[PDB]
Symmetry: C8
Subunit: 65 residues, 8 copies
Amino acid sequence: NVENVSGVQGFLFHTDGKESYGHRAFINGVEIGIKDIETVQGFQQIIPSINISKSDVEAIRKAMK
Amino acid sequence: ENVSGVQGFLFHTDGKESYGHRAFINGVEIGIKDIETVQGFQQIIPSINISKSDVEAIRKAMK
Amino acid sequence: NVENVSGVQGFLFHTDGKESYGHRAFINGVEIGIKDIETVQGFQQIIPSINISKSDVEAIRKAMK
Amino acid sequence: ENVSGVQGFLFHTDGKESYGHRAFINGVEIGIKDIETVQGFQQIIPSINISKSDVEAIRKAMK
Amino acid sequence: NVENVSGVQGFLFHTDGKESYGHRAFINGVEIGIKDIETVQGFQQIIPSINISKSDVEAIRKAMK
Amino acid sequence: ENVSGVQGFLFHTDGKESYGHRAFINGVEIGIKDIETVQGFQQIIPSINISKSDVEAIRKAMK
Amino acid sequence: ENVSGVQGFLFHTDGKESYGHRAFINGVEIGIKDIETVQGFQQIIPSINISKSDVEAIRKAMK
Amino acid sequence: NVENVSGVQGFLFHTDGKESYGHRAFINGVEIGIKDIETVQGFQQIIPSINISKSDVEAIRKAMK
């Protein structure tokens, strides 16, 4: 819809399942772990935050180059 | 602009012979195992119906 | 108008004339036949659906590379 | 974004010497034989009037 | 503002001064003369129509490659 | 999208030493002789004020 | 379109060990010394919170 | 949000601190000084105008190539 001023493309992801892996993100094609909730809430201001099951992360990694 | 860095769609059939949920994500076809992941990606990409008999043709059109 | 999230460019086409060829589509420059109405209704969620006479398909093919 | 993958326009003249309906579609000029096809493409590209005497100049400007 | 579906970039131009040169246009970087008013009204549906004095056409040509 | 195929701006000064109206059109600087042309291009590109003393610096920033 | 010619974001932490205000501007990471500059760039780019412990990972994702 | 017709990307900058450097601008990646207020008000019609402390200009220069 509207232009992306941030120079950041990607999303935060986590699971609400029984085996959490914390919060992680794809940022410009680079997967990282997020250690602090402050950082999660900061990036929630500029990129989407979605749910991904632990069993599906491997497949998402291959699609995100 | 597309802030998510994701282009593609989820697809499945409601016919009698399900192939589960799959997706094209940035030109890469993957299977999706869990409904949590389906609903997560439904927040950022479209989700459409494709019959099992038509998947082969859609595969050739994509990538 | 609005951005294309689907990564799909093209259209469905069919004729309402006397000699139907079923439903077909151009998807990212690739022409395919569509076998099932479920697939037609699915792609109608993301790409246009237009009418093309059987006599005009040959000319449209050459324009769509 | 243009989801249809089609860029161009239909053109015809309402003058006394018709040349039918034609179109530039993705830089390729074609003739259109049937009104069903004209109305189909009118859903996704503009349709304008061009006199027969001006088609040669428009051809040179396109492609 | 909104996307250009026509595959045409340019403008019609004419002068209302004392020495008219008729209607002309830049279409995709190519300057052409327009012979018939039907064509002027057709292209007015998809590209702007502006006034350019005869004395200024030479300078506009050099800017339009 | 910009349908006009023109990117740039008109510029002039209202100071005591006018340099007339000029424009950058697609990275090419030109002089404009007639007010009809100024008002024509004001329909499709912005028109701003630039002092004579600042034109040299704007020229270096453009093209 | 982005008229400012600036893509990026300001970042800081509200934790106990501040690293001040920093920014990624067109893929270049810089420190910002003065609040006037922070408020100036807040007019044109987003400003987000990043914990000190996460800056290393964000650096690797950027540039 | 909306398209940039001007062919100009950048911003004006100045400080309201104790040691002013006047008005300056980045125009298409080129830093210039602005001598006259007429020019400042003209470019304020097409590009943003922001505050930058004198102490921070050096860092902004390196980010703006």
